[PDB]
Amino acid sequence: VTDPEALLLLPRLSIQNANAISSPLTWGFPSPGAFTGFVHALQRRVGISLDIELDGVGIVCHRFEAQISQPAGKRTKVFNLTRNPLNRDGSTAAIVEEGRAHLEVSLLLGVHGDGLDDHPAQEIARQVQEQAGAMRLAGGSILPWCNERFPAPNAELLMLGGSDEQRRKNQRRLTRRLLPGFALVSREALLQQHLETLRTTLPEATTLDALLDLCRINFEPPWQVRDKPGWLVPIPAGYNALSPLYLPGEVRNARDRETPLRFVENLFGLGEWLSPHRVAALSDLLWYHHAEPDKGLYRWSTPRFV
Amino acid sequence: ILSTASVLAFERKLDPSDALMSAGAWAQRDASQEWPAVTVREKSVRGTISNRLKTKDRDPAKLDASIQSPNLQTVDVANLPSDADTLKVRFTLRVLGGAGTPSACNDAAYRDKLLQTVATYVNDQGFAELARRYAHNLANARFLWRNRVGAEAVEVRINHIRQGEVARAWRFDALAIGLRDFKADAELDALAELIASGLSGSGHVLLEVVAFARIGDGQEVFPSQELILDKGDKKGQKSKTLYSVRDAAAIHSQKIGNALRTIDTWYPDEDGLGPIAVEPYGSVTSQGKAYRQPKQKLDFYTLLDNWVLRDEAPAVEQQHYVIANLIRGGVFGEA
Amino acid sequence: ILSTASVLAFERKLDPSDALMSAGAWAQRDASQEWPAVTVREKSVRGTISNRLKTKDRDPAKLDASIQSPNLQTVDVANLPSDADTLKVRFTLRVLGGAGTPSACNDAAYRDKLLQTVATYVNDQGFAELARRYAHNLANARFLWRNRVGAEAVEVRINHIRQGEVARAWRFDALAIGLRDFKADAELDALAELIASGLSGSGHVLLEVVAFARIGDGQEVFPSQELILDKGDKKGQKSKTLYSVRDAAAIHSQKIGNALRTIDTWYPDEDGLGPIAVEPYGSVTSQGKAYRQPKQKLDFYTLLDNWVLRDEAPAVEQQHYVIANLIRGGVFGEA
Amino acid sequence: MNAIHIGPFSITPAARGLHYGGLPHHQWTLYYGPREMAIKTLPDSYTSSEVRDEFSDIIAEFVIDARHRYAPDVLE
Amino acid sequence: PTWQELRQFIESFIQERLQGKLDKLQPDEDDKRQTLLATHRREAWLADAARRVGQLQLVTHTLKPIHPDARGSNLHSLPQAPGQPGLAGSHELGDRLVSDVVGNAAALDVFKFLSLQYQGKNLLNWLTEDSAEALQALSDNAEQAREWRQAFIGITTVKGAPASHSLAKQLYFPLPGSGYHLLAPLFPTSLVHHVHALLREARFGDAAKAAREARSRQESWPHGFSEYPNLAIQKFGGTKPQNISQLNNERRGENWLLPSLPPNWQRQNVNAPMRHSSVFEHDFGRTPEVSRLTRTLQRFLAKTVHNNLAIRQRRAQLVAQICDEALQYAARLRELEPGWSATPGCQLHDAEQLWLDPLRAQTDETFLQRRLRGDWPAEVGNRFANWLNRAVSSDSQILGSPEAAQWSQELSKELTMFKEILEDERD
DNA sequence: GGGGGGGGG
DNA sequence: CCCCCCCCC
């Protein structure tokens, strides 16, 4: 919703057991809403004391490992589980299938505020790094890099460049820092135009079928494969309204009785993983919240991408 | 009237990393940064029927027919190399601050009462006994589990990482410190002071825990076995599967946490086992029996509602158990 | 009424390792730590028709048609080099102890009764006959299964590894010590006392066992062999796959365990065959017939349910068999 | 059970049954006449359709190789 | 139209249920037939159904897939269609909507008593309107018909207070100006059932299997197929999938999650090309990603020009991906040893070694640290361009036409970008 | 057909 | 908390 005055690079963060089930329809890399919520929790915890705002997160995902296995005779996969403790009668409890993933991601954070002029860049960078080293990113603990060879501090780069060439060199150096990974971006325009292409191909086609067609490998008879522009993952694109926004004390057993609750349904969109050298600026990769609370639509996206 | 909060959840304080397992030689433990990792391999077993028979297949003809059909499995096995008698197990522990602060709470009054109860607990005795028992369970390598059973010598090195360097190095003989006695030692008290300051603090305390076990040359190490459901599939699967991160055998973080939380020596049953893991309704998976039942007034939930709501503060041991549950975490709250 | 527990899981005492086989020469076996490992190479076999026919292809036309077009296979084969006559097989055994205590037990009172039963056994007749027979099965190289059947001379060296150093060395002629007679020898009695001290919990016993067998220059050795689910054609008709850990042939640990457990000379059938491997229902896969069937009251489960549940103590050799089963370990217990 | 005859193909099981995993298994053999092409271990709970579908990929690969091996010549 | 045919159909339904439970019980004595016909043969069974419709609930989004000891408010609501483009949901389910049933496993029979087609339409939409044939076909009395209609139509409306349990998920969302919403999500079991049905047609349908056989026969077919690789199975009920919901009893567990995976989710290893002559043609080129990219360039090079420039745009994008992977290869070459390029060897591609190992400038103070700074190696991509010249088709029709000119233009532009990327490696 | 489990008393 | 009926293997 705003252009960041600076970009803070949180380095390689090893998230231990992240929620591999991103959505009721998708598994794998966690939701971008988890990353945006983590950055908002960082702004809630240490952002206010530094007189800065932390909005917008760019994910690089340097490493992914899924705690999964492939059973023999099946082409699908299953989630490795954890043994929950027994009940009070000594019996095994009912198992809820929860999957885990070891992530290694680096985050570009959009920083704007007067506190950037009040503190050194390395000071606020080290403060938000040591705050983020005791938090969670998708349900997993963050490994804060103890007793390895060379630890990685941040590099907060001011986006108000004095010259266009110096700004370009800064963005290319920051892209070179986060090199072995893929920027995950939102593709609402690509999914909508592919929906229009399928509607010209066949009418009454929903956005779900256009999302599904952009993920399966289509085999065409003369036997070739229908190509895709990018990786084109199905991402959770936010939450849509399923109920009116009830009063803060209205909903029974809410998390807090001061925040209003509204039952939601998952919104599914198309995301794309790209090499981060294929972007004009690294501020395009930032994932922003977008509530629009009168109509539900509690989305996260990448505005100012293309 | 101080009703209990309908959601009440606590973060996992003392959250460990996955215990990376590597191999090497004893008296080369100082240069253990380049030790090759233990790799999980596959092998085949042909056993014979040795389970109990239910008095319908005990006839010699059917039993001989069952033996005549060969029973075969594939098992994931982790072994030490035949020139490395020492198993090194390394993980990172983050002692998080705000141990008595819940993640979620409905009632503001219940949150204030719980914070006041925890604050009176820190003002009275602190986390000093609990961090002593946590430093004990770090000091003996209970997180090695079956790697600790037949080892010649186990030694635990624990390094406090303040910013990027070892702020304080502790070295413990893990076999000398028992699995069931919580005694007093100067280095153990210093580690207890550090862990209690991390629990009482606002940030976190970072520790690197490395355990060297002299199991034997080429012996079988025991990483955590992965819980994979067969789900009634037609094709036979491998019976035993292990855990690894990247060609490197590992123990699950919850197993290391369960070994770290094995401090509960205050359950109403007899302590023939010794300490058990701090669980609500005192569940022990190795026994199939749950101590600290709610029919007695010593389970975690009734102790919390007595300590917080009705102001019936229990004994100091049960207060230690309640705060150990709060450090452990969990999802509580009636409907 | 003292019902037996649903889970009575026992750990494995006398823990073996994957016995790696290298190659070398006789009279150079003293310096054998640099010996090159036996490689599991590949070769091709042309299989002629040599099995029983099913009274349908017994016609000469279809038999000659099948013989005219035979079938080819690729086998993993492990051989000595053409300049190496001696096979060396190396593994480490770990005599743990605490054999009466099970790892998991649903019933505490049944666990106490089993502990009292094993304690009264040890007070009456400890691990003296059992460790003597285990030292026998180590002394003759029964873990050389088909590497012993035509060996010219087998020599077994057992070194007690204490603090990374050899505490005591044993050197046995494995052909003089038979595979069926359990006689007495002073060095064998010393090894029996060491395994007794390991099994009683009075000491930590790790042994390095190296067996040198004279098979011949280039002769085929017999390591452990893996199961092959699919042959296919992408894999070039892989019919036999032998076991190897890292470019080095090896025997499975459980095969060494089964060879070490061959102490049971007290089954109700005649001992003209000799000892059989200790197992519930005394099963031999090569014989295909269970000695100690559940019908004749001499198997492990009925003897354990008489000795412990109903205090019906069996004979001294039969309770030796029961305690040998407890040393072997298993998933004893009903569903 | 019994052999599955797919044209010239015969899927015949071994009479011996193994117990891979815990479930019983049988080693099923696929022949094109006297030549075997795929020996695969399959459960006894498998139906005939599942045993057919296990070897259907090798069957289709052999069909494709026979089409591309004995294709007639082309005059342009 | 007539109430008599609806009465005949519901009497036939209860008679079929009566003879089904008589065949299931197989009773020949002990007066079980009289007790069975005394409660499931008359209108009182409908009154008994009045005791069963209040227990069941027809929902589209439920909470019971989240931890089964949680008791929340499962609600049947169709979400509004979002005005923003390019995102899907359960709002896309229009007439292709299957409503899940939650409640007891014994009252569910009355669900088909609300799902028959007597006059040609579903009876819940028949009972949502005050029709003439309605309220007479099931009850002779008016008030009994009204209360039966209200109880039978209450299976759609949510019962109890609006509530989400503690074990359910609740996630704060930051408002634009100074606020939060708690936003408890529910499992879209109707949407999951629709996606699972579509995947069932895609993977085990008759037309899909026929297209798979046509691919296996390498013959033509009027329609294609799909594969859906890397699917994940998430079983909700462990012992009784029927305890979760009725739709989860239709598909026993098996959530069938789509692979939203990053491209580095299957990182094999990092290897150092020691005894080899060129990195692009021996080690980097054998990775499967650039393998599929090179086969894609081979397929797109020998093609018609009717969509040419647009295809060329795709081709430009395609060729960009390959040099991206080259940088990605260099990226994982940052994960290797600092001084692997200084090892001994007769041939180790020393022309590329200034870019292969950037960390050897830390190893050597002046032996090779100043060499990369003074040389500024950017010609290596030209060597890679030579390897990329092995990615083009050997067709003289492209060389005669301007297709080779456009290929050389986009190749020169992308290796200009690659050389500019390799130029400022010293910063 | 048998055994587990949910639901009503 | 115990018994019976339904549903799954």
Swiss-Prot record, chain E:
InterPro entries linked: CRISPR-assoc_prot_Csy1
GO biological process, one term: defense response to virus
Domain of life: Bacteria
Region of interest called Disordered, as start-end residue ranges on this chain: 69-90
Free-text disruption phenotype from the record: Mutants lose phage DMS3 infection-dependent inhibition of biofilm formation while there is normal biofilm formation in the absence of phage infection. Decreased production of crRNA in the presence or absence of phage. Disruption of the entire Y.pestis-subtype CRISPR region disrupts crRNA production but does not alter phage resistance (possibly OLNs PA14_33350 to PA14_33310, and the flanking CRISPR loci), indicating this CRISPR is not involved in phage resistance.
Keyword Glycoprotein attributed: no
Keyword field: Antiviral defense
One of the Pfam families matching this protein, by short name: Cas_Csy1
Further remark: In this bacteria, Y.pestis-subtype CRISPRs do not confer resistance to phage DMS3 or MP22, but instead are required for DMS3 infection-dependent inhibition of biofilm formation and possibly motility.
Main function: CRISPR (clustered regularly interspaced short palindromic repeat) is an adaptive immune system that provides protection against mobile genetic elements (viruses, transposable elements and conjugative plasmids). CRISPR clusters contain sequences complementary to antecedent mobile elements and target invading nucleic acids. CRISPR clusters are transcribed and processed into CRISPR RNA (crRNA). Cas3 and Cascade participate in CRISPR interference, the third stage of CRISPR immunity (Potential). Involved in crRNA production or stability.
Family under the similarity heading: Belongs to the CRISPR-associated Csy1 family.
Self-association and partners: Interacts directly with Csy2; part of the Csy ribonucleoprotein complex with a probable stoichiometry of Csy1(1),Csy2(1),Csy3(6),Cas6/Csy4(1)-crRNA(1). A Csy3(6),Cas6/Csy4(1)-crRNA(1) subcomplex is also formed.
Name listed for the protein in its UniProt record: CRISPR-associated protein Csy1
Organism: Pseudomonas aeruginosa (strain UCBPP-PA14)
Taxon lineage: Bacteria, Pseudomonadati, Pseudomonadota, Gammaproteobacteria, Pseudomonadales
